[PDB]
Amino acid sequence: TSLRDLIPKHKFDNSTIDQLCKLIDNEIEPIIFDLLKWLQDYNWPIAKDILPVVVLHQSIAMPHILTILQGNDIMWKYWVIKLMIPYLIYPNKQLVKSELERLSSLEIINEDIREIVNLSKDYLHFYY
Amino acid sequence: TSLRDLIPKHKFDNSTIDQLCKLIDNEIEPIIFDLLKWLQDYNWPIAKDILPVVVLHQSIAMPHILTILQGNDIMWKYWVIKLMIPYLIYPNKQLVKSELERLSSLEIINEDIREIVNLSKDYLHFYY
């Protein structure tokens, strides 16, 4: 009772991983965005267990992934892009190409942006 | 046999990818071993599109992933470890831990074995 109870509460909280690993696309969808938030910094221990889960349920995560790419959380999109793009099946890989091209042609005004543009350029040439 | 026609014929054969991307675990299972063969060299262009599909279906591929890790093709297990393990959900990750420990124990006598030991030791420290 309480699907939201399965969302990690902090960056070390792997207490719900075993439960999360049993869900199918339809059951996890209502908290998928919340689980994506634990990829905001892959340096977090919980991010390691969360990544395999969100990738597995990629086909209900795409609208939330786009939301992240359009937003202003540079660190979050850096990890989502770097970590999830190489593992999206073809139709999903296509849904985010626009955003990757847009990121590749951001004006470089700092090192974080340089990271994002360069990553977005590498991944276009590599996976597309 | 219809299903076996969905196996790529060669390293440039992405003609079956759209059909492969629609299948569920139990449909794809009988050819998952043949699909894993396209990770024998990730430099093969079709490998990029096969990887997301075999990871998506990890929970019917584990027996075959064990065979590869226990087998005689060093390059093949190299790509399977390097590419798939970071994206196995927790229970599936645990299933291959013993193989990584075994491989990390190989006496290093050439650079290919060196690659395998370094990779296994790194992944054990990082993901386990």
Author numbering:
A (entry chain B), B (entry chain A): 2 to 129
Give the article text.
Cthe_2751_is a 15.8 kDa singleton from an anaerobic, hyperthermophile Clostridium thermocellum, with an unknown function. Therefore, based on primary sequence analysis, Cthe_2751 is a non-Pfam singleton with an unknown function. Each monomer is made up of 8 α-helices arranged in a spiral pattern around a vertical axis that runs through the centre of the protein. The structure reveals an all α-helical topology similar to those observed for nucleic acid processing proteins.
We have solved the 3-D structure of the non-Pfam singleton Cthe_2751 to 2.17 Å resolution by Se-SAD. The 2.17 Å crystal structure of Cthe_2751 in space group P212121 consists of α-helices and loops with no β-strands. Cthe_2751 crystallized as a dimer in 3 different crystal forms. Superimposition of the dimers crystallized in different space groups revealed no obvious differences in the position of the Cα atoms suggesting an identical mode of dimerization in all the 3 crystal forms. The analysis revealed that dimerization occurs via a large area that spans 904 Å2 (12.8%) of the surface area per monomer. Interestingly, the aromatic ring of Tyr88 from one monomer protrudes into a concave cavity formed by Leu52, Pro53, Leu84 and Tyr88 of another monomer, zipping the monomers together. As for the crystal form P212121, the packing arrangement of the dimers clearly deviates from those found in space groups C2221 and P4122. There is a 60.9° orientation difference between the corresponding dimer in P212121 and that in other two space groups (C2221 and P4122). As expected, the inter-dimer distance between 2 closest dimers in space groups C2221 and P4122 is relatively similar when compared to that of the distance between dimers of space groups P212121 and C2221 or P212121 and P4122, where there is almost no recognizable co-relationship.
